[PDB]
Amino acid sequence: EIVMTQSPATLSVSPGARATLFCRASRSVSDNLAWYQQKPGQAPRLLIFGASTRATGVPARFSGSGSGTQFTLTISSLQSEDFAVYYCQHYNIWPPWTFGQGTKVEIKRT
Amino acid sequence: AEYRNWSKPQCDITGFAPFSKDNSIRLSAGGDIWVTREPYVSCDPDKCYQFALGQGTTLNNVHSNNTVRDRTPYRTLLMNELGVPFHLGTKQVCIAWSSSSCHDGKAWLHVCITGDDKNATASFIYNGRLVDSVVSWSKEILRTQESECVCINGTCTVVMTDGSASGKADTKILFIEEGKIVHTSTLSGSAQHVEECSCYPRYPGVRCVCRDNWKGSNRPIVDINIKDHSIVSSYVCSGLVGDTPRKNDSSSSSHCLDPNNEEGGHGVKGWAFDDGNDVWMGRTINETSRLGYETFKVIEGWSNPKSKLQINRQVIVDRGNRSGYSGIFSVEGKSCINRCFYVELIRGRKEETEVLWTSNSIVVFCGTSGTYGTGSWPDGADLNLMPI
Amino acid sequence: AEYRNWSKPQCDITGFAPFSKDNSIRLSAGGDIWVTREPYVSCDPDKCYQFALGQGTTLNNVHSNNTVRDRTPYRTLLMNELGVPFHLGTKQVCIAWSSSSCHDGKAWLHVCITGDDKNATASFIYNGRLVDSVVSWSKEILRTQESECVCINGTCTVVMTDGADTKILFIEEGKIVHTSTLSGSAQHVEECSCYPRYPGVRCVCRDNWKGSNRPIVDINIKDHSIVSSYVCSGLVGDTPRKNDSSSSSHCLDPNNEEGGHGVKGWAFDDGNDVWMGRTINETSRLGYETFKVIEGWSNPKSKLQINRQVIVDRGNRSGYSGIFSVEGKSCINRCFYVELIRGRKEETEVLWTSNSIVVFCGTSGTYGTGSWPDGADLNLMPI
Amino acid sequence: AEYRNWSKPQCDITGFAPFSKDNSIRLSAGGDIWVTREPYVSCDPDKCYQFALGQGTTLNNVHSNNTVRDRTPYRTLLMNELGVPFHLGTKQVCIAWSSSSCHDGKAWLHVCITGDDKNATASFIYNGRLVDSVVSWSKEILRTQESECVCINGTCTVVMTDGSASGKADTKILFIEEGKIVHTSTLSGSAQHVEECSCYPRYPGVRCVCRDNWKGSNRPIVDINIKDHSIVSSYVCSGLVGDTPRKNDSSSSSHCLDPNNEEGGHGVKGWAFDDGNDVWMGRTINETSRLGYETFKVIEGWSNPKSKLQINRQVIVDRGNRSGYSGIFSVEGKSCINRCFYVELIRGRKEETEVLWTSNSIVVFCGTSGTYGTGSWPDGADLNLMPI
Amino acid sequence: VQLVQSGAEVKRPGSSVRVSCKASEGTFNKYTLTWVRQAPGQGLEWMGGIIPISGIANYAQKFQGRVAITADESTTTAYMELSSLRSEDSAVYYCATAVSDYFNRDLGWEDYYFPFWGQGTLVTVASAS
Ligand SMILES: *[C@@H]1O[C@H](CO)[C@@H](O[C@@H]2O[C@H](CO)[C@@H](O[C@@H]3O[C@H](CO[C@H]4O[C@H](CO[C@H]5O[C@H](CO)[C@@H](O)[C@H](O)[C@@H]5O)[C@@H](O)[C@H](O[C@H]5O[C@H](CO)[C@@H](O)[C@H](O)[C@@H]5O)[C@@H]4O)[C@@H](O)[C@H](O[C@H]4O[C@H](CO)[C@@H](O)[C@H](O)[C@@H]4O[C@H]4O[C@H](CO)[C@@H](O)[C@H](O)[C@@H]4O)[C@@H]3O)[C@H](O)[C@H]2NC(C)=O)[C@H](O)[C@H]1NC(C)=O
Ligand SMILES: *[C@@H]1O[C@H](CO)[C@@H](O[C@@H]2O[C@H](CO)[C@@H](O[C@@H]3O[C@H](CO[C@H]4O[C@H](CO[C@H]5O[C@H](CO)[C@@H](O)[C@H](O)[C@@H]5O)[C@@H](O)[C@H](O[C@H]5O[C@H](CO)[C@@H](O)[C@H](O)[C@@H]5O)[C@@H]4O)[C@@H](O)[C@H](O[C@H]4O[C@H](CO)[C@@H](O)[C@H](O)[C@@H]4O[C@H]4O[C@H](CO)[C@@H](O)[C@H](O)[C@@H]4O)[C@@H]3O)[C@H](O)[C@H]2NC(C)=O)[C@H](O)[C@H]1NC(C)=O
Ligand SMILES: *[C@@H]1O[C@H](CO)[C@@H](O[C@@H]2O[C@H](CO)[C@@H](O[C@@H]3O[C@H](CO[C@H]4O[C@H](CO[C@H]5O[C@H](CO)[C@@H](O)[C@H](O)[C@@H]5O)[C@@H](O)[C@H](O[C@H]5O[C@H](CO)[C@@H](O)[C@H](O)[C@@H]5O)[C@@H]4O)[C@@H](O)[C@H](O[C@H]4O[C@H](CO)[C@@H](O)[C@H](O)[C@@H]4O[C@H]4O[C@H](CO)[C@@H](O)[C@H](O)[C@@H]4O)[C@@H]3O)[C@H](O)[C@H]2NC(C)=O)[C@H](O)[C@H]1NC(C)=O
Ligand SMILES: *[C@@H]1O[C@H](CO)[C@@H](O[C@@H]2O[C@H](CO)[C@@H](O[C@@H]3O[C@H](CO[C@H]4O[C@H](CO)[C@@H](O)[C@H](O)[C@@H]4O)[C@@H](O)[C@H](O)[C@@H]3O)[C@H](O)[C@H]2NC(C)=O)[C@H](O)[C@H]1NC(C)=O
Ligand SMILES: *[C@@H]1O[C@H](CO)[C@@H](O[C@@H]2O[C@H](CO)[C@@H](O[C@@H]3O[C@H](CO)[C@@H](O)[C@H](O)[C@@H]3O)[C@H](O)[C@H]2NC(C)=O)[C@H](O)[C@H]1NC(C)=O
Ligand SMILES: *[C@@H]1O[C@H](CO)[C@@H](O[C@@H]2O[C@H](CO)[C@@H](O[C@@H]3O[C@H](CO)[C@@H](O)[C@H](O)[C@@H]3O)[C@H](O)[C@H]2NC(C)=O)[C@H](O)[C@H]1NC(C)=O
Ligand SMILES: *[C@@H]1O[C@H](CO)[C@@H](O[C@@H]2O[C@H](CO)[C@@H](O[C@@H]3O[C@H](CO)[C@@H](O)[C@H](O)[C@@H]3O)[C@H](O)[C@H]2NC(C)=O)[C@H](O)[C@H]1NC(C)=O
Ligand SMILES: *[C@@H]1O[C@H](CO)[C@@H](O[C@@H]2O[C@H](CO)[C@@H](O[C@@H]3O[C@H](CO)[C@@H](O)[C@H](O)[C@@H]3O)[C@H](O)[C@H]2NC(C)=O)[C@H](O)[C@H]1NC(C)=O
Ligand SMILES: *[C@@H]1O[C@H](CO)[C@@H](O[C@@H]2O[C@H](CO)[C@@H](O)[C@H](O)[C@H]2NC(C)=O)[C@H](O)[C@H]1NC(C)=O
Ligand SMILES: *[C@@H]1O[C@H](CO)[C@@H](O[C@@H]2O[C@H](CO)[C@@H](O)[C@H](O)[C@H]2NC(C)=O)[C@H](O)[C@H]1NC(C)=O
Ligand SMILES: *[C@@H]1O[C@H](CO)[C@@H](O[C@@H]2O[C@H](CO)[C@@H](O)[C@H](O)[C@H]2NC(C)=O)[C@H](O)[C@H]1NC(C)=O
Ligand SMILES: *[C@@H]1O[C@H](CO)[C@@H](O[C@@H]2O[C@H](CO)[C@@H](O)[C@H](O)[C@H]2NC(C)=O)[C@H](O)[C@H]1NC(C)=O
Ligand SMILES: *[C@@H]1O[C@H](CO)[C@@H](O[C@@H]2O[C@H](CO)[C@@H](O)[C@H](O)[C@H]2NC(C)=O)[C@H](O)[C@H]1NC(C)=O
Ligand SMILES: [Ca+2]
Ligand SMILES: [Ca+2]
Ligand SMILES: [Ca+2]
Ligand SMILES: [Ca+2]
């Protein structure tokens, strides 16, 4: 069972600023990785697959990068829409298709 | 001719000398050669034959595209004398997307599996005519050894599995006499998942080393008693475990009875055999991809779960060159049963995006009591040049 | 079937009549024919087979480029009935970049050499299964006859060299039963063309070091003893060599005249006369001729040739050549083959290197003249 | 197996039913098929084989250009089971630009002629090894039957000629036992030119019908006595003469002893055989070119020089479609020797400038006591479409 | 593509619960259907799925032998029956499409990521009334 790990757990970031969310895998998952946004109470929303391909409904401001054991989701300028939990997930060859414990992108302020 | 019995003792193996190579993919670049995967070698009393599941197409062909799928209606079991590449004159023995074959001392038995995934048929073709068939008992991709079966005093045995791959499967051992299924034993003992057994005769029994796709990176052993159909099972005790993926040799471990859980899930068809308490075995050189191939003897690695003393290592394909399945086959010498093994050398999709097809060469090695040297016998095709 | 013994006397040869030709390179221009080199012919009791070290590729192929290297992991010993060109249905007998084969009267023995140059393995494949193997003893390209071995009462013999260090392996059903280190005065011994000479086996080799005269190795199957010497003929058989006006030989020593390098060739005794074949040119493997030298087996000074035959004229490339022996009704005939190399590096018109063969047999009957070159037009076919 | 003897009587032939066709040129348009000419058919006791002098090349090849020359160092005698087209796996039996073959009841004898025109060698290859050879005795294109030889009690006979074609030639009949030439008889009786004899066993003798290239448009008969090597010769008495060119049937005539002089010069390899006094024979339908092919029985045309009563005509290739050589071969049935014949169907140069090569298909017919119908079995290739 | 699921559930321990998911026309012929859990404070957890030709279903280690996943093209509804419920199973259950079309018995699954998700069914497992 491959273990996905995300950091930081609570990536507090101000509006308009850039955020980057890190994801680690307990062994190389190749580029077989995806990222899911989740607003509080809604179903998850696929943002990235194949570690870098954006999904159908996904604006330019979300970009995925990395391969092997370490991956990053970059959010170039946060709209109020973007403050959500983000789950990492491998889909490399064999079950289980484990998810990360998720990073909450909080709104940073005074 | 009498039925085969393999009563002769096993040869004093000190390593494996090269025996054959096909160059199927190098020849495909200017020739009508079949697209294959899951190749295997088996021998009649006179000569060895190479088998493969042909994707129902040649390689320089429109039908070679998307040949990465392992189950289609078009897959057929190609058969040739060993070393004769699979050219258009090759006999398609039977319709099959999974199979096993063995000469019983009188004639070939093929176990040819085909059909819908949820409802496959296994066809037993003996002396070139369909003698029996059996339907998928767990309705979830009936499948077999993708390598030679074994026959002793005419009773061939084939390990077959049905049910989930990354989960608890249903495995039966079919005892076949002249193609007629005479008995069936459900898998017993502690092997918890048992795909793709590489079997070898170990008179009076047959023994097989398999692929634990679920929880073991150690390989399961199935020990089959032809005289009373009883089955027992266990795992390759070697601390150097044979499956892929696996933990590296510094951190890997095994258990004689249980799947070792270390990188348990997924696997590759491979082999190992006992030499008293020592275990000969072959594995990919890489632990996370099927790159390279090596063989070695592990001192007490059949009996002792903690042993990591390897000796007699041989690179067969260096760590830069792709391998794939591998399988022991047994050759009856003048006064001992030699253990040979083969390595599928997969090329093309999905690892090599330079071509649209997926195919394999093979290379074959035999156990030798005599000295041997070194080399590396990779597939050898240049996919940057040949038909995309 | 009984083991072969070759006890019959040798035929009253008066020259060689044509026996076979493959046209492998002419057929390659529109066909899936294998790239080869170091071909050879050997026969079971019923029919003859052609062997070659296939470069693991067909000729009209991407893998035929740079096939000039003689050792790669992909080389395999192709086998066919004689005259059946090496098409895709050809059996790759074993992995091999150097080899020898012979039917022992019961089944084929192949000696298949492969591996790293510094550490090669020889595999003995008998009745189609690997029976034995032996590692390079001098760690410097283990190599063998590139032609038929010989078997008498089941004990096959194959000359092997490393480094030079040369051993004769005595093989019974593929199991190496004895090994003799080379003895007598042959100082370098590559690529022996052997022929049965009951009770012994005799072989004529390539001195790559100091002889343009060919070494003879005379092998005693009943006690494994080896003795060796050189082809006494003043018309020496190797290439390069000094021209016939200025060449000489010695029965015991390499003649030193253009000694270094060589080509695989053959010769055989006919009482004191020696039949032999050689390239017509003395500095390149162009042409091929055969002739009888009167007393040229016994007498170091003889240059009386007779019964000359051009086999390939001086304009057309040859290559290796090797005697093979065919058991007739009441005498052992000596046949020989000529490799007809084409392409790189002499012919830059193509990227590949391959060979046709042509094969001739000894005849007591009359024969005429001709020239049977390879015959491919490299200006036209696939570059 | 015993040596062949053909002691059985000849079958009650009423015409020839179709037996085989190769489609070699139709298959060449998408296949690696050999370029040939001077094909022939001969049979072992179990099955028939087709032979041809291959021009040392496939047809869709650069080496197929200028294949109109009948003598080159590259010509080899191709051999296959009858109907298996000459593909790349075909065995080149021997080096040969002229040849003859026959199974003696134990093994194949091939007579393979090669060399310089002024100094050719004939090689006798028996049981697959060269047993004897003989040099051109008149130093002017040694040549043989381009069709099966005949063997009775092991002594094979082959007619060979040397010397001028449009002039007085030297002809010898070689008696061969297991490839060793045991006797040689110089041609005797009144045949004045004797090329390319189509022989047939006529126990106790062998009989052959040949091509008079010099003075006869009537065909020479050579009647060979195996028990004492004596030779006698004469001509096909039929007023309907078998050679090409010839005078048309209104104006042609023959002589039982002499070349008829009518359009004597040049010829084509053909055949005829006796049926008591009637003569079965085959000839091109055209009298000035090798277009079409027909067969018929001429009543008393073996014994009577004036007969022109044909009956049982069969078109084999209609007058619009090219033929070429043709040759009887004999097949040992259950209780009679059947006479079959073949027709070379030449295509390409120099008559058909649409392609650069010259090659042939064949078609083969057998004598039948039973009824038969009609047809026309031409070569069938479209030279406007295939490789130029 | 659209997916809609059965309303919320409250269930007694040791019992089963049978969540349903009506997918859009032809969905089960193109995408693997899967069930993914979300325990109230925890991360996502795939339970299993069903292959979109053979209808063969594959389950996660933690649920194998007590979940059943089944589908019917007549209604284009898929159902998850979860047996032997305990308070650990109190979670939102989402049905989701997985792009994986096919399973190689040797090379495993490609593209097992979830582009379309149901609205999620809240399941609660307690002895309380
Ligand atoms: C030409 O061709 C031939 C034939 O192919 C080649 O020979 C072959 O070479 C390979 C090299 O890989 C050999 O396999 C290797 O074998 C060794 C084990 O053998 C050595 O150690 C033995 C044990 O030694 C200890 O214990 C004894 C007491 O029992 C003490 O006296 C010692 O001091 C030690 O403490 C020892 O018994 C062996 O001796 C015998 O063999 C040698 C020849 O090899 C003779 O000189 C002796 O006289 C005697 O007959 C021998 O010394 C393994 O250790 C190798 O595995 C390691 O290496 C692999 C890479 O090479 C690696 O991938 C493995 O995982 C493993 O390495 C790991 O584990 C080790 C142990 O924990 C660690 O030390 C290491 O750091 C790493 O973590 C391998 O199995 C073949 O045996 C040999 N075959 C034959 C038939 O000889 C030859 O190499 C070629 N030459 C050229 C130039 O190409
Ligand atoms: C058609 O096909 C046939 C079959 O292939 C062809 O026949 C073959 O032709 C070749 C021609 O090369 C012959 O090989 C050559 O043989 C001669 C040796 O033979 C001749 O000399 C013999 C010795 O003569 C001396 O001694 C006797 C006493 O013993 C005296 O009486 C003499 O006067 C001399 O002093 C002699 O015994 C031979 O006679 C026999 O043979 C002939 C037929 O050849 C008969 O007429 C006789 O009746 C009798 O049976 C004969 O006269 C060699 O000399 C040749 O080698 C030289 O030539 C080569 C080129 O041709 C060259 O490359 C060699 O290096 C070599 O030349 C060098 O050496 C010479 C001395 O040897 C020097 O003089 C020369 O300057 C140079 O330095 C060659 O070996 C075949 O024997 C013959 N085969 C058969 C079976 O007959 C025929 O040619 C073809 N015809 C056509 C038109 O295509
Ligand atoms: C379907 O398939 C079958 C099988 O293939 C076909 O049948 C075959 O058809 C061909 C047609 O060419 C026949 O060959 C020809 O045979 C005739 C000879 O046979 C006829 O005449 C015989 C003699 O007749 C005279 O003498 C008798 C006394 O003996 C008198 O009574 C008569 O009046 C006459 O004066 C006669 O014996 C024959 O009778 C027998 O056969 C017929 C069937 O054919 C039966 O009806 C009878 O009952 C009886 O059994 C018969 O009548 C030849 O003349 C033919 O050759 C001429 O024609 C060729 C072109 O067709 C031409 O190229 C030749 O050069 C030649 O022509 C020249 O010579 C002529 C005289 O010979 C001249 O008159 C002419 O002008 C010219 O100068 C030819 O050999 C096959 O025998 C026949 N095969 C079988 C087994 O039956 C059938 O045709 C097919 N049907 C269809 C629709 O496709
Ligand atoms: C058959 O095999 C041959 C050897 O494997 C192939 O020849 C080689 O092909 C490659 C790819 O085209 C060449 O590499 C390129 O070289 C050029 C410049 O080459 C010239 O300059 C260098 C100076 O260092 C010199 O070494 C060369 O020989 C040339 O004079 C570079 O700009 C590229 O970046 C690239 O490196 C090799 O140079 C070439 N080998 C030789 C001997 O020239 C051949 O392509 C194969 N042919 C077929 C049809 O299969
Ligand atoms: C396993 O099968 C083999 C056959 O593949 C059996 O081999 C047989 O064993 C006996 C005893 O070694 C051989 O005996 C010999 O027979 C000849 C007559 O043919 C006799 O003249 C000799 O003196 C000798 O007794 C027998 O020939 C041999 N069969 C063959 C074909 O070699 C073997 O016994 C079987 N073993 C078991 C456990 O079933
Ligand atoms: C070399 O091996 C050959 C076999 O390849 C041995 O030849 C054989 O010798 C014997 C004794 O002379 C021959 O026996 C005879 O057979 C015929 C029937 O074929 C019979 O009529 C006689 O009365 C006698 O029994 C045998 O035929 C012969 N085989 C062949 C193929 O010629 C030869 O003896 C061996 N030589 C040495 C030195 O070992
Ligand atoms: C031409 O060769 C054939 C063989 O291909 C010879 O045929 C043989 O002829 C004789 C006399 O008719 C047959 O003899 C009989 O044999 C049986 C036993 O097989 C016996 O019961 C009878 O009392 C009688 O002796 C013989 O079987 C037969 N062989 C075959 C295979 O048919 C033929 O005689 C040869 N012709 C000439 C002119 O030499
Ligand atoms: C079969 O052969 C004979 C002889 O070749 C053919 O007879 C000849 O036919 C031609 C017409 O094609 C006749 O030519 C004419 O002759 C007269 C008188 O010389 C002249 O005034 C005309 O201008 C024309 O040249 C020729 O005389 C005649 N010869 C003989 C000897 O009869 C016959 O045509 C052929 N039959 C068939 C069916 O083809
Ligand atoms: C063999 O496997 C072990 C376990 O995966 C590897 O151990 C890791 O070692 C690195 C440093 O080399 C540490 O950063 C990690 O913390 C270790 N992993 C764990 C899970 O503790 C070891 O590196 C591997 N050895 C080789 C040679 O690859
Ligand atoms: C095992 O094989 C893998 C696959 O080739 C190797 O991992 C790759 O390493 C290179 C850098 O050397 C990267 O560019 C690739 O992206 C890696 N691939 C993946 C899928 O992660 C690995 O180095 C090999 N390790 C051993 C022990 O042989
Ligand atoms: C055979 O060999 C000798 C020695 O190499 C050749 O003789 C020389 O020929 C060259 C011209 O080619 C002269 O310049 C030298 O002076 C000669 N040297 C001697 C020692 O004579 C001879 O030419 C060769 N024979 C043939 C026919 O090529
Ligand atoms: C032997 O073969 C060589 C090679 O073909 C011949 O030498 C060549 O001769 C031509 C002129 O005729 C030159 O243009 C070449 O450059 C030469 N090549 C080399 C490598 O030197 C030689 O003439 C032949 N000699 C004999 C006796 O056959
Ligand atoms: C015999 O064959 C020849 C060759 O095809 C025929 O002669 C040709 O006839 C046509 C007109 O029909 C001319 O255009 C050609 O030039 C002729 N060719 C030659 C070489 O003369 C002839 O008609 C045929 N005759 C018979 C009886 O079949
Ligand atoms: Ca595993
Ligand atoms: Ca030399
Ligand atoms: Ca093609
Ligand atoms: Ca004429």
Numbering used by the authors:
A (entry chain I): 1 to 110
B (entry chain N), D (entry chain O): 82 to 469
C (entry chain M): 82 to 244, 250 to 469
E (entry chain G): 2 to 130
What do the authors say?
Neuraminidase (NA) is a receptor-destroying enzyme that cleaves SA, facilitating the release of viral particles from infected cells. Three mAbs—FNI9, FNI17 and FNI19—stood out for their binding to a broad panel of cell-surface-displayed seasonal and animal circulating IAV and IBV NAs. Collectively, we identified broadly neutralizing NA-targeting mAbs with unprecedented breadth to seasonal and zoonotic IAVs and IBVs, which can synergize with anti-HA stem-directed mAbs. Owing to the functional constraints associated with the SA receptor interactions, the key contact residues of the FNI mAbs are highly conserved across IAV and IBV NAs.
To elucidate the structural basis for the FNI9, FNI17 and FNI19 broad neutralizing activity, we determined the cryo-electron microscopy structures of their Fabs in complex with NA from H3N2 A/Tanzania/205/2010 at 2.9 Å, 2.3 Å and 3.1 Å resolutions, respectively. In N2 NA structures without the glycan, there is no clash with the antibody and the 242/252 loop adopts virtually indistinguishable conformations in both bound and unbound states.
